[PDB]
Ligand binder design. Sequence first.
Ligand SMILES: NC(=O)c1ccc[n+]([C@@H]2O[C@H](COP(=O)([O-])OP(=O)(O)OC[C@H]3O[C@@H](n4cnc5c(N)ncnc54)[C@H](O)[C@@H]3O)[C@@H](O)[C@H]2O)c1
Ligand SMILES: Nc1ncnc2c1ncn2[C@@H]1O[C@H](COP(=O)(O)OP(=O)(O)OP(=O)(O)O)[C@@H](O)[C@H]1O
Ligand SMILES: C/C1=C/C(=O)O[C@@H]2C[C@@H](CC[C@H](C)/C=C/C=C\CC1)O[C@@](O)([C@@H]1CSC(=O)N1)C2
Ligand SMILES: [Ca+2]
Lengths: 413, 355
Amino acid sequence: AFIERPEDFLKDKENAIQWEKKEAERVEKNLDTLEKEALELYKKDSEQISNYSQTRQYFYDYQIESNPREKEYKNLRNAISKNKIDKPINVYYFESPEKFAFNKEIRTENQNEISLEKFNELKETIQDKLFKQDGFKDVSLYEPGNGDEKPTPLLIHLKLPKNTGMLPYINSNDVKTLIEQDYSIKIDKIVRIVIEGKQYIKAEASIVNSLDFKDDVSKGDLWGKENYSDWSNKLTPNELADVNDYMRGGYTAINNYLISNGPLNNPNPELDSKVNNIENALKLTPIPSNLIVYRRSGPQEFGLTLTSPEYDFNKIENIDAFKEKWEGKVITYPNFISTSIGSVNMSAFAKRKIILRINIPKDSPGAYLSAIPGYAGSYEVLLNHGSKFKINKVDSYKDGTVTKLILDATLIN
Amino acid sequence: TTALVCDNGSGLVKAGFAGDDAPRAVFPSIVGRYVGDEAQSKRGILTLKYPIEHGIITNWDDMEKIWHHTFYNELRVAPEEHPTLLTEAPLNPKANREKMTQIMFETFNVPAMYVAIQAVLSLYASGRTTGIVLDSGDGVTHNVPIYEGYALPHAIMRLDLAGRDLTDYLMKILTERGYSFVTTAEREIVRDIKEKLCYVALDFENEMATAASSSSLEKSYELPDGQVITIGNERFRCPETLFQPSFIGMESAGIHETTYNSIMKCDIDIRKDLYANNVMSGGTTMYPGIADRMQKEITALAPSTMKIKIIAPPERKYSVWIGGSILASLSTFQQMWITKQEYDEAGPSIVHRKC
Ligand SMILES: NC(=O)c1ccc[n+]([C@@H]2O[C@H](COP(=O)([O-])OP(=O)(O)OC[C@H]3O[C@@H](n4cnc5c(N)ncnc54)[C@H](O)[C@@H]3O)[C@@H](O)[C@H]2O)c1
Ligand SMILES: Nc1ncnc2c1ncn2[C@@H]1O[C@H](COP(=O)(O)OP(=O)(O)OP(=O)(O)O)[C@@H](O)[C@H]1O
Ligand SMILES: C/C1=C/C(=O)O[C@@H]2C[C@@H](CC[C@H](C)/C=C/C=C\CC1)O[C@@](O)([C@@H]1CSC(=O)N1)C2
Ligand SMILES: [Ca+2]
């Protein structure tokens, strides 16, 4: 081995393991008793602890706060985020293709080959998409090889940048590596390889970071006020007037005008002027960082109503039908559209079942409206009329007895 | 010399004199484009318009007309001669209360005024400074937790679901029964049916079985032209909407759940006091059976050892106004009035320092 580790151990399993063993031993010196306790519990209950780490943020603020699982989540997350790599490292792990919205088998486990057919279907499915990742995950510093465990046909080869938190540790005979996913994945390239007599897809993947405040709405509100206080004071009197009219409930008229294509077949100069001013307000201080926002959608956005049989997502067939209709598709909103920096459920939309989780590229049109005094309880980011979103992936989760959907989407204009 | 109390709502203005036990005037919060029952006496060349929407003033020109009508036509006083207490919704924007203050001093030239939070006044009407208020009117409903006289803004819940939505829902389900209630005048009729015949069922699914199985729950109502109609399960399906907003297509928490959410947003140390002092005010809390039903729903959500009390006085339709009448007439309140002189010295933003 060299004195300095490589960015990628590749197939050098023996050095990867030894290095990470020394690393586990060094990090033991920086974990307090509670963090060590958190790790032990994770070793014993990893699946449920990871599961909690993926969907904890979607409940009421007070439900999150009083869940005793928060202690484990917080203490383990702190153990990880502390131990930051000082240059990039590549990691390896197997995923279900379903995770990247390929809802069928690439090949069965008893087959050894992957058809060009499947290969091309997978490529078209995972091309040109940013897939959101959450929660705790065990990864390998070396590529799985002959006699390694390989649960699926999809191997992810992920590059992680400098300052990524990684927790090297030992679980009985094995040296492991824990991360908490907090980014989106781009699959730059897929290739078919062979390991121990079977074909696997290897995905060359990298990450895109975004600000995601999740349930930390105070941190998100500080960020918003930080960045949009003078936007609040830089609007023309016309723009401020029209924004406040919009926010005060003028939105319903303005947005229905837009959705009905009023500008074409029923023009109205008064409304057109307001639409223009609001748009110009949203271009005044473009979204200053990649940002995740959340919207609790009415079913009508997805062609459903409250009493639509297909809105019963407690039945898996209805989830499948939703995915077949929407997953991988791009949708457009002729209206201006409200989102929040927070993921928490709220009284006003406590029962809405469809959550949009949207990646907003830096410099997109948009504004943290809640930087205007009067109604900041929304933690609102208003997006521009005519926005287009690519739906990357549909997940589901339980909110009590009710199955709800999370739509991993990206703003593409 | 005598202070005025003007409780401005989405549907009705309640106005009168501090020290009286009831408002002298209650009239509709509408303008014609004329105010109140004048705005509909000639609603031909004109249309009825509601300046206060979901508890918030949205049109200042129209609101000036409402206040004009209040002083000169309803109370027959000069604004220049009376300190005037106005009420506002919880979480009323700060620019709204500044604009209310500006209009009072610069348009009406009042000698003094004050703006009080409606829910705080209704709590005070029952002699309390600590409790959680369910205030439900024509346009909006709030849960407002209050501790030692201070509303707790981070724990306030607002639902845009109230009496007018219940009226409109009743029109629809009566129409599905075989009647036809659709026009603006028919909407007034159905509001009347709602106010006289509706109630909240203690057990809703049970109540729906009963009604399906008997005429035991049916009631009759005589229309203005003498046609007598029947109303059955609509009596309780109508206000059931408050607990189940999906009845009108809304995916919000119902009023029991917003009450619980509000309490859960408060400091743990004060939650027992809130549970023990759930107070109801406003016209849409007048349904027989609503207190019992809330008791049952909150009992299901809260810890089994929790002592829950719902307070629903017979006067609660006017308890915001009554609270204002008591407040404005207190010795220790007199120092709190914003005088015209204070307005001249300090801007409209004087409201924030004094309230
Ligand atoms: N929903 C959220 O997650 C969210 C986030 C932040 C703030 N808000 C606040 O709540 C209020 C806005 O509520 P909202 O966003 O639920 O109402 P909205 O105006 O977006 O939706 C009104 C109704 O129209 C439907 N709709 C909207 N766009 C549509 C389209 N293009 N095609 C078909 N149907 C469409 C919705 O499903 C809903 O039934 C505002 O005060 C806003 O500040 C909401
Ligand atoms: N006995 C009753 N039963 C049911 N509803 C009633 C009764 N009396 C009045 N209401 C309803 O209460 C509403 C009026 O009450 P209130 O004056 O408290 O509201 P507001 O102050 O005008 O509106 P808001 O408080 O929402 O701004 C109307 O919808 C009316 O139909
Ligand atoms: C006795 C009464 C009570 C009342 O609350 O009226 C208020 C005010 C009213 C204005 C429209 C017409 C002019 C009313 C005129 C006169 C007096 C008030 C009527 O619009 C409501 O009716 C709406 C419509 S239906 C409903 O649920 N709210 C609420
Ligand atoms: Ca009121």
